[PDB]
Design a protein that fits this description.
331 residues, binds the ligand O=C(Nc1c(Cl)cncc1Cl)c1ccc(OC(F)F)c(OCC2CC2)c1, binds magnesium ion, binds zinc ion, 3',5'-cyclic-AMP phosphodiesterase 4B
Amino acid sequence: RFGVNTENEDHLAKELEDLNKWGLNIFNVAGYSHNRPLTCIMYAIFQERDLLKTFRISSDTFITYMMTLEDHYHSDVAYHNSLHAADVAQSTHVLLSTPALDAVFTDLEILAAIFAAAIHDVDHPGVSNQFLINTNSELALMYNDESVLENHHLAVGFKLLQEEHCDIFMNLTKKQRQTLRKMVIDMVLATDMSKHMSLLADLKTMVETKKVTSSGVLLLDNYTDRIQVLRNMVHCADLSNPTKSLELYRQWTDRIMEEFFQQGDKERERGMEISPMCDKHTASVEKSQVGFIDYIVHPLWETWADLVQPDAQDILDTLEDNRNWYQSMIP
Ligand SMILES: O=C(Nc1c(Cl)cncc1Cl)c1ccc(OC(F)F)c(OCC2CC2)c1
Ligand SMILES: [Mg+2]
Ligand SMILES: [Zn+2]
């Protein structure tokens, strides 16, 4: 089905043993599956959690949909291609298994979070919301300058479900489809970085009033509480590159800066003001990664670590180490 060469056969399976671990190498997975990491990992994650059985999704329909989804990720965009969506989906799969959230979420909520991660950047053009708005692009006109890309990703992901041969949610009840849709919209719209501060603040509240039962698991009474953790989960996963091993983090940084600089060039050709971190002639990649961790990634992930204490300590230590590595690359 994947046509994985007889030579990449066991290499792939050897990589997929780390499926449930933070240390999984999605680059290795993309290379052994003929650059189909999103399809590959999503199939693996769905078999592990036995989601195909629970929601009666035929294996053919699942593959057909994921393949088409993966094809809507642009392979010429340096960072926001299917490897990132696969990375965010697999990272979310690991966060959902963290001991402090054990048995807290329904199967339907697990399905929604992983599906959301998978579609969260589909058909990304390699430019930011602010670029699309400043250039009066069709998408900004379409979405009235609000969470332009995030709304688009959702629109494409759900639209690919319209044909029967691609409808993975055909066996959910009407009710389940409507709840899953609400959760997915919510989670994907929350990946808009302009909502980041609002999200971090609400998560700090959740940590302050966190009630963990005798089982050592968090108590989340209402839907409001659960979707609040899920939004933050996908958001942390989206901002997890600097929490990975240094070998992986540096390749992600290479990819993001290649995309950001490409937008700098486009802004320069059009006579627009260049965002300072986006300017290949002046910006220090190393200073920007240090600023990224101190002011965005560390504040979020330390808060997340508090809520799931102590499951995330390794993540925090890797983050401080990677930060110090980039700081040591600045003269
Ligand atoms: O913003 C990001 N991601 C992103 C998210 Cl989480 C949500 N919405 C849009 C984007 Cl671009 C993002 C992701 C990864 C980065 O570096 C490394 F980890 F690869 C990075 O560098 C900051 C810095 C150079 C100026 C920025
Ligand atoms: Mg995005
Ligand atoms: Zn993303």
